[PDB]
Design a protein around this ligand. Structure first.
Ligand SMILES: Nc1ncnc2c1ncn2[C@@H]1O[C@H](COP(=O)(O)OP(=O)(O)OP(=O)(O)O)[C@@H](O)[C@H]1O
Ligand SMILES: Nc1ncnc2c1ncn2[C@@H]1O[C@H](COP(=O)(O)OP(=O)(O)OP(=O)(O)O)[C@@H](O)[C@H]1O
Ligand SMILES: Nc1ncnc2c1ncn2[C@@H]1O[C@H](COP(=O)(O)OP(=O)(O)O)[C@@H](O)[C@H]1O
Ligand SMILES: Nc1ncnc2c1ncn2[C@@H]1O[C@H](COP(=O)(O)OP(=O)(O)O)[C@@H](O)[C@H]1O
Ligand SMILES: [Mg+2]
Lengths: 593, 592
């Protein structure tokens, strides 16, 4: 076994002292392993599973069973060697030397006879035909496997196995797949409890069950790039290392696990703990902080989302469905961005789609995709692709009233069944998404008093009272009552206020100041300048959106030339004062030390 | 230990003898790696970064912390050595001779039990089997690596690590990645303050703190191929060497700037009074070539001054501009003038055509070959070109004819200036000028005189209405999360009359250069220029037909006269108009 020792590791004597692992809850797969191994022919098991799943745990459990336990005939005292293809290429200046030692080791097995082999992730000795320079030593074992002289067990991943191993007929014929899936939360709890003994033996730690539960929950929630039964081990080992490095027996709690996860990635503690009810209450000010002034809108949205987050509804419909009725330049997009930022921590967690160009018939195809064999099949629909990229996001529908009704049908199954099927055949889930439909229906009379012809002065307070009823009736008459029944809430955006414009301009000015402080520049605005920018930068058919260009045209353009001229030196504060009256008012800059 | 000394080096004794550079501002990295090594599983830490950032520096910091005694138990105080692969490979004529030495070394290090090994470029030790003639000696280390009786620390880059260590699962269960990052400006300044004593002693020179900070800043902002701790130290060494080779020697800001000016060429100047002064009248310089569009160049100048004075956000590049004019009226020439003005030459505007970047897989080769792609060497072109010439202009022609997903990459271009291509290594676009030229801004205006008798005309609302049309068309045709993240959309209308005369002057100057190549010259009267302007004016076709008109009416006659022999070297041709009305013709007189 010298060649085996050079390019592999034996398992039977290692498990004879049993210094590998205590197997937890993997009896059925191991029994199936013996079942497949006992076959006269086709006795080449392969375990398909993700890297997080403990497929090697099954193999070492088999080794432990062979060492001690119930083992049927033709399987007792079978020496099991794991082979690493990354080591077999040792000293391979040219390709032939690889196969020479390959034949030497295989004749070593044939002389040995009582050998069971375990392979690595596979599809590197047989799937090497798609690479340049890699060793394609595939048919090396085919005659010996066909003659039944050698028995081996492999392991792969399901998708890659289907995309390589299902191609060649000989490989798929002489290999029996065995499915290993991700263990659930309780199973990981018993696994952690079983490994806690060895972890406390190695790391001088005292581990509590609540700490293990918190570790598993945090690993499942805040980590998704890895699979379940490894990240808990990583967290507990890192916590043990961090406590031992700090070190007249110490203990670990859930606080240490949360701190470890935060240090790995994420904000320190806080959100990693359980504060949901208090998390919702502090949300109210946060929304009223991001958008300056909605009162009823934010209140209704908050009440709806607090209601829906208290778990009562089954996971068959999305978290929330809202219809934002209001004119442009009010802040519906800003409110949606703020809600997404609070709920998921990312600004880009919003998916914005405009329905003004979805009016005709066939355009709706690009919202789903195309049938196979036609243009635009490689890329799916915008909605389906963007949703399947980010399962936790907020869907936004701009100008819904202009969209063609057919998509509403799919919207129906979005709002009732909570899932959709794309043209590629996959399934996209909308359970964790919140759907918002922005609309401007009924705001034309509110925004513009004159509609077409001879109008009187009228009033402006009745709409201020019954805007919600007006928009509800307008949506009921314009659209199908069933769809309005499916949707959950309606939120109406009233007109802006001058003081709100003052807060907006204050935010823009101090955003400028916090970055211009690098040169130690202070910016001061007079109240006259505030009102002048408010009047110039506001427009009823545009709202507060022209302000971003207005201040840039007014302040930044003059500031740039004033700085570049040299009249202003680092370490000064500029105060803005308006010179003139009415349209002749001009912003002027006064420098102070 | 003869085996260690013959084929490896000692850092603990060297740290005890104090023969290496001091370590400053790397406490977090060393704490992280030394707590990683204490893990029960995956206890073999591997450092992932780029060369010259301080991998050896943090390793020496670990060795120093070990030798000084400010370390805890659980390896307490022991020996950390490094393996020199050059000594191992040398003296091994055959593979059997090579492997028998490695196994002996590993057996000794395992038997002593108080030795921790360090290697550099770990990718070679584990991934040499994909190429012929390279020894992949991982089998020497793999068994006892998996057995947990051998501990090693590795240094590797992110490309090699991603392509070698993430692929194999077996080692991925044993190596823990730790990221090491390039230090900030204060940390680099502290490193230079640490190394100044040694470099002054060796070079017999003196260096000022102002020189240190200026060198760090210029290395940060004017060099992209290298890294801050890797480039500033080398540039300081080169400046000291120049000062010593010139002849107490002292170096100032002028020397520490001129050394880079000589090294990288293209003597771009620092923030100077002349540089700011020329920007206040640069519109006139841009009008020396571009004629007939003052509002567009004024907007461009406003944007450039805003982003140059230090008023625009640092998150954006030097500028993002969308040109959506018709054909043959602007663009291209404007970009050339801007490049010549800004980056002191015409070699800028590396330029790309988007129309051939239409298929999805084409988008692949513009930004790096994916793993498994046949011919992996076929990486990105834009990334490499920008990397090699960071101070150039990027100009994409016909952005309409392009695959949509390429426009995704542009989001990382403007939002961050960072592309971090997989095998393209560092892709930093820093402060560059990005110009997207498209032909979707073409409407019917000159023909448009409205249905009706009418009697009126306005030339003011043109820019605002064209801006509205172009903005609406772009918003309808394309997503807004990229349209909002752009500096400006510079749109200009068709060239107007009374601008043709300057264009005629420029083209006549070019023709005059062509004649002067053969020792000749050309000059025209105002009547000839106005006749050419009248004959070659096309409202919608732009200034292109003017060149054809000159070609038909001017140098065809010149060519036939030269061939006939009437015109000879050392002559000047005078062009006049003869006749009246539409019957005016050109007359050529050759004089000495
Ligand atoms: N109430 C508000 N709170 C914060 N910002 C606002 C508000 N109203 C307008 N803005 C500003 O206006 C710009 C975007 O316009 P806004 O958020 O009003 O659009 P919207 O009304 O949601 O859009 P739509 O035109 O689709 O109705 C941003 O600069 C944003 O800061
Ligand atoms: N305003 C101008 N000033 C100077 N030259 C001009 C001007 N307008 C057009 N030209 C000349 O017209 C020719 C074509 O100009 P240019 O290459 O800039 O056009 P373009 O609009 O970018 O091209 P395309 O036809 O691909 O849209 C050049 O010879 C250029 O010098
Ligand atoms: N049923 C189980 N009982 C005990 N430990 C387990 C079990 N399943 C997984 N593990 C542990 O999870 C860890 C990671 O699984 P591993 O076998 O490395 O997966 P893979 O083989 O895909 O890399 C192993 O070290 C193992 O100890
Ligand atoms: N953070 C740092 N602390 C101490 N020295 C540093 C640091 N960063 C860079 N250096 C110095 O830069 C020089 C080159 O760095 P180098 O060791 O080649 O980096 P790497 O190990 O990443 O290749 C070294 O001599 C080192 O002294
Ligand atoms: Mg052009």
């Amino acid at each position: 076994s010298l060649v085996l020792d050079q390019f592999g590791r034996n398992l039977t004597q290692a498990a004879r002292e049993s210094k590998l692992d205590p197997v937890i809850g993997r009896e059925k797969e191991i029994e199936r392993v013996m079942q497949v191994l006992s076959r006269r022919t086709k006795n080449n098991p392969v375990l398909i599973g993700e890297p997080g799943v403990g497929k090697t745990a099954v193999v070492e459990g088999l080794a432990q069973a062979i060492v001690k336990g119930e083992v049927p005939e033709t399987l007792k005292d079978k020496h099991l060697y794991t082979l690493d293809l990354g080591a077999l290429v040792a000293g391979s200046r040219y390709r032939g030397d690889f196969e020479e030692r390959l034949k030497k080791v295989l004749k070593e097995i044939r002389t040995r006879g009582d050998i069971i082999l375990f392979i690595d992730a596979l599809h590197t000795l047989v799937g090497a035909g798609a690479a340049e320079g890699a060793i394609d030593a595939a048919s090396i074992l085919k005659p010996m496997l066909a003659r039944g002289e050698l028995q081996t067990i492999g392991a792969t991943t399901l998708d890659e196995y289907r995309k390589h191993l299902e191609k060649d007929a000989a490989l798929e014929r002489r290999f029996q797949p065995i499915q290993v899936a991700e263990p659930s939360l309780p199973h990981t709890i018993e696994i952690l409890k079983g490994l806690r003994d060895r972890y406390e033996a190695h790391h001088r730690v005292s581990i509590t069950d609540e700490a293990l539960v918190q570790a598993a929950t945090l690993a499942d929630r805040y980590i998704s790039d890895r699979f379940l039964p490894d990240k808990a081990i990583d967290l507990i080992d890192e916590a043990g290392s961090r406590m031992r490095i700090r070190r007249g027996v110490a203990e670990v709690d859930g606080e240490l696990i949360a701190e470890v996860l935060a240090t790995a990635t994420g904000i320190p503690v806080f959100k990693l703990t359980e504060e949901e009810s208090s998390r919702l209450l502090r949300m109210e000010d946060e929304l009223h902080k991001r958008v300056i002034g909605q009162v009823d809108a934010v209140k209704a949205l908050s009440k709806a989302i607090r209601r829906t987050r208290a778990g009562l509804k089954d996971p068959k419909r999305p978290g929330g469905s809202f219809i934002f009725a209001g004119p442009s330049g009010v802040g519906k997009t800003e409110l949606s961005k703020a809600l997404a930022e609070f709920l998921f921590g990312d600004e880009d967690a919003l998916i914005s789609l405009d329905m003004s160009e979805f009016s005709e018939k066939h355009t709706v195809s690009r919202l789903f995709g195309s049938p196979p064999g036609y243009v635009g099949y490689e890329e799916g629909g915008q909605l389906t692709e963007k949703v399947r990229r980010k399962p936790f996001s907020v869907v936004l529908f701009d100008a819904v009233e202009k969209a063609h009704p057919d998509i509403f049908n799919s919207l129906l199954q979005i709002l009732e069944d909570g899932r959709l099927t794309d043209s590629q055949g996959r399934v996209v889930d909308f359970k964790n998404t919140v759907i918002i439909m922005t609309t401007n229906l009924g705001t034309r009379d509110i925004s513009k008093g004159f509609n077409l012809g001879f109008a009187a002065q009228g009033d402006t307070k009745s709409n201020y009272e019954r805007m919600k009823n007006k928009v509800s009736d307008e949506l009921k008459q314009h659209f199908r009552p069933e769809f309005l029944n499916r949707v959950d809430d309606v939120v109406v955006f009233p007109q802006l206020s001058q003081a709100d414009i003052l807060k907006i301009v204050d935010l823009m000015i101090d955003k400028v100041d916090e970055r211009l402080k690098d040169r130690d520049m202070g910016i001061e605005l007079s109240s006259s300048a505030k009102e002048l920018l408010s009047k110039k930068g506001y427009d009823p058919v545009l709202g507060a959106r022209p302000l971003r260009r207005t201040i840039q045209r007014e302040i930044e353009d003059s500031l740039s030339e004033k700085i570049l001229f040299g009249e202003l030196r680092p370490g000064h504060i500029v105060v803005v004062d308006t010179e003139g009256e009415g349209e002749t008012k001009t912003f002027t800059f006064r420098g102070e030390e």
